[PDB]
Amino acid sequence: DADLRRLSLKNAKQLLRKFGVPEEEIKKLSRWEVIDVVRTMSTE
DNA sequence: AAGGGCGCCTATAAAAGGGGGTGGGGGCGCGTTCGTCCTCAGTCGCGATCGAACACTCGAGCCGAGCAGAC
């Protein structure tokens, strides 16, 4: 979660693209929501 | 047409300061990069509130025993 917050939005966007997260969540690009979704996907 | 007589230049050294040059060096200014500080956002921890479960107390019902009445 510390390194996930240290992802600095842009690389988290590329990671969400890599996992196969749908483009709506990538599109809103809220940082906190993005990092919560990528933490959830790394839990999944 | 011919017959005569003299300063210009050139050269040498030396000083003075200007005229007459573009080239090099130094200084200043501007721009870019890096570092530091501040602000914002996110995450984690703690506290408070709400809900659920368990325990205790009270009330009600049922059963048993005793007493009284009748045969």
Q: What is the DSSP string of A1-44?
A: -HHHHTTTTHHHHHHHHHHT--HHHHHH--HHHHHHHHHHHHH-
Q: Yes or no: say if A25 and A3 are a contact pair by the CB < 8 Å rule.
A: no
The Cα A44–Cα A30 span in angstroms is: 21
| Distance measured from the CA of protein residue A23 to the C1' of nucleotide B15, in angstroms | 94
The Cα A7–Cα A12 span in angstroms is: 6
Q: Yes or no: say if A34 and A13 are a contact pair by the CB < 8 Å rule.
A: yes
Q: Which distant-in-sequence residues (6+ apart) come within 8 Å of A19 by Cβ?
A: A38, A41
- Give residues 24-43 of chain A lying near strand B (Cβ < 7 A): 30-32, 35-36, 39
**Token pair belonging to A21:** 């997260």
The Cα A1–Cα A28 span in angstroms is: 20
- Nearest C-alpha neighbor of A25 from the set A4, A8, A15: A15
| Distance measured from the CA of protein residue A29 to the C1' of nucleotide B10, in angstroms | 96
